[PDB]
Design a protein around this ligand. Structure first.
Ligand SMILES: O=c1ccn([C@@H]2O[C@H](COP(=O)(O)OP(=O)(O)OP(=O)(O)O)[C@@H](O)[C@H]2O)c(=O)[nH]1
Ligand SMILES: [Mg+2]
Ligand SMILES: [Zn+2]
Length: 363
């Protein structure tokens, strides 16, 4: 193959060891923290580690010094109120409970308060980290527009860990997701039904930068579903297994992430590139899996054409300024409210240039 994509995949593979070692350090610290939370008497006594995200999907290809971790908390009887038109943001309310509400301390005027819950969450984390301060682990100061409590691990490696609190609701998916997860052709109706019977999650997200009740909103998270469709990505159950056939679906996702990350290193993460992240290419990739549902379309030998399909689709989204959230179709990740036109223009041009020259940024 002229692009020599197998050699590129070998290069990104080199990063694997560093990422696995760092992940062990992160897991040690977070397991300590979890055991403290679970042995305590706080509302967060029921938290558990939610093993999702790029690391557990095995597509974390970079940034061994940066991890995010999700703590899930089962919350019964949730009732959502949409913040606005989109389904991007919700207020969390509760349905009547004759047995009570363990989260009463966080209620403010009908609504579960995110700032109240996070303050208490941050407080508990800070006290547990202070208790083990000889370990060299500290809590980073609050960042603007970040729902996370960031841990700074200094030894034996410098690692930033974003701890994200996620509410778990074992209830029907909200109406905004009705035409979401369009995987029927790709994975089948049975798989789609099974996945939509899983719980959904809520993580704190500000609706707009203002000061006000937009500070109290939550966004949906389906990171556990994303993990499953990445891991069990074939029409056949033996796709990419030892006794099955190798497809190149994951390799393509990795190359798309790597493309964006190498462009940022090439250009110095300038203003135009700073708003694009791996979640945009992951979303584009899922839409491509839907348009090309068959395992034989992704046979390993077909790597160049498959990767080119992903790139071409991503180019089409940049030009049309349309990239629908895979679970919430009414949410456009490429709207002008989020990313201005010249930024899309600049990335389009660079991707077009890379494509026409065999992706020299990879080398
Ligand atoms: O539904 C989503 C999910 C994720 N995101 C955004 O994408 C970013 C990463 O989101 P994720 O943490 O959930 O995806 P990821 O593991 O696969 O990506 P990386 O960690 O490698 O970066 C987060 O900073 C979040 O703000 C959304 O905006 N919406
Ligand atoms: Mg992540
Ligand atoms: Zn496969």
């Amino acid at each position: 193959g002229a692009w020599k994509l197998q050699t590129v995949l070998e290069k990104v593979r080199l990063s694997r060891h560093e990422i696995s070692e760092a992940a062990e350090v992160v897991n040690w610290v977070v397991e300590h923290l979890l055991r403290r939370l679970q042995g305590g008497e706080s509302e967060f006594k029921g938290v558990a580690l939610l093993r999702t995200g790029s690391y557990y999907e095995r597509v974390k290809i970079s940034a061994p010094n940066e991890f995010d971790v999700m703590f899930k908390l089962e919350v019964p009887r949730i009732q959502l109120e949409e913040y606005c038109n989109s389904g991007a943001h919700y207020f969390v309310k509760f349905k009547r409970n004759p047995g009570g509400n363990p989260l009463e301390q966080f209620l403010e005027k009908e609504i579960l308060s995110a700032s109240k819950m996070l303050s208490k969450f941050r407080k508990i984390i800070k006290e547990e980290i202070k208790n083990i301060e000889d370990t060299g682990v500290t809590v980073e100061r609050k960042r603007r527009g970040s729902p996370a409590v960031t841990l700074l691990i200094s030894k034996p490696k410098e690692i930033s860990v974003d701890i994200i609190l996620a509410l778990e609701s074992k209830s029907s998916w909200p109406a905004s997701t009705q035409k979401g997860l369009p995987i029927s052709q790709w994975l089948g109706a049975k798989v789609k039904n099974n996945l939509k019977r899983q719980p959904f999650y809520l993580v704190p997200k500000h609706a707009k930068e203002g000061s006000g009740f937009q500070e109290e909103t939550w966004r949906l998270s389906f990171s556990h579903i994303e993990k499953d469709i990445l891991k069990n990505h074939g029409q056949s159950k033996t796709c990419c297994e030892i006794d099955g056939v190798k497809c190149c679906r994951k390799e393509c996702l990795k190359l798309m992430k790597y493309l964006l990350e190498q462009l940022k290193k090439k250009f110095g993460n300038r203003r135009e590139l700073a708003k694009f992240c791996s979640y945009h290419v992951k979303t584009a990739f899922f839409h491509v899996c839907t348009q090309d549902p068959h395992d034989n379309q992704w046979h390993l030998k077909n790597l160049e054409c498959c990767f080119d399909n992903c790139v071409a689709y991503f180019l089409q989204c940049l030009k049309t300024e349309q990239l629908a959230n895979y679970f919430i179709p009414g949410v456009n990740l490429f709207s002008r409210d989020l990313i201005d036109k010249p930024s899309k223009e600049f990335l389009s041009k660079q991707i077009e240039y890379e494509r026409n020259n065999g992706f020299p940024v990879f080398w």
